[PDB]
From a paper:
We used de novo protein design to generate very closely related proteins that adopt two very different states—a short state and a long state, like a viral fusion protein—and then created a single molecule that can be found in both forms. Inspired by class I viral fusion proteins, such as influenza hemagglutinin, we chose homotrimeric helical bundles as the fundamental architecture. We decided on a design scheme with two divergent conformations containing a constant six-helix bundle “base” and a variable portion with three inner helices and three “flipping” helices. In the compact “short” state (∼66 Å height), the flipping helices fold back to interact with the inner helices; in the extended “long” state (∼100 Å height), they extend to form interactions with each other.
Author numbering:
A (entry chain A), C (entry chain C): 2 to 93
B (entry chain B): 3 to 93
Amino acid sequence: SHMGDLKYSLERLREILERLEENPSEKQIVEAIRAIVENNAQIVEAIRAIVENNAQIVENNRAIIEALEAIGGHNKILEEMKKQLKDLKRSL
Amino acid sequence: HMGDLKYSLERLREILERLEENPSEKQIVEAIRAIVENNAQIVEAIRAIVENNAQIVENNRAIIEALEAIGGHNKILEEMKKQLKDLKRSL
Amino acid sequence: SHMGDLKYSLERLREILERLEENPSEKQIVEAIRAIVENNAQIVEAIRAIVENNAQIVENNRAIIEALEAIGGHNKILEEMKKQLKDLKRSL
Ligand SMILES: [Cl-]
């Protein structure tokens, strides 16, 4: 969506640029500037979506640290049970 | 950056209006200057994103480690069920 | 690579702008516009790589969810083992 719109907006701008070099004009210079502005508006919208989406990076990190915490808990529990078993089997 | 980014383009949209209203060599050049300054902010925003994206790779590494540990715990648990089952059957 | 190219491209554009304000001319205005287009084309390529790269955020999330699922499976097993042992040691 954004990138399809982005590269189309740039190809439209590349067309204006060619006409401009073919046929320089105040009207075409201004029209080229307008197209640049509209393209920059799409670049800003694209960056905005990336930033919004980047919030998932933070929540992935938080869940990883929780997972590591739980894994560390399990490890301590597992070391107890090995001691219990060996002790208790050595028992009998 | 985002607030600065969208403000920078709003400023740019104003110049564009004046440009189409009263074209002028001065205003064309001033519009070009504003575009450059806007592009300089776009590049800075992309730079912060790339820097920030390094966290994606470290999240992946930690995930892989977590999966390794979980697989380790798994093999331990299946042996433990064996000893318990066998020990209870012992008696 | 991308961002190294990005800041060079804007450095090139900043110098054109300097010459433009020093010696305005149709040729230099058009040349400035061309440089802007080429810079925008690089901005778009950089965003494209970021979006491609951001797919890793989704795969990290899926793997975390799996890891959490497994941890919850282990947790229930451990509580079963906890009771087996205690009752089996109280047993005798
Ligand atoms: Cl991530």
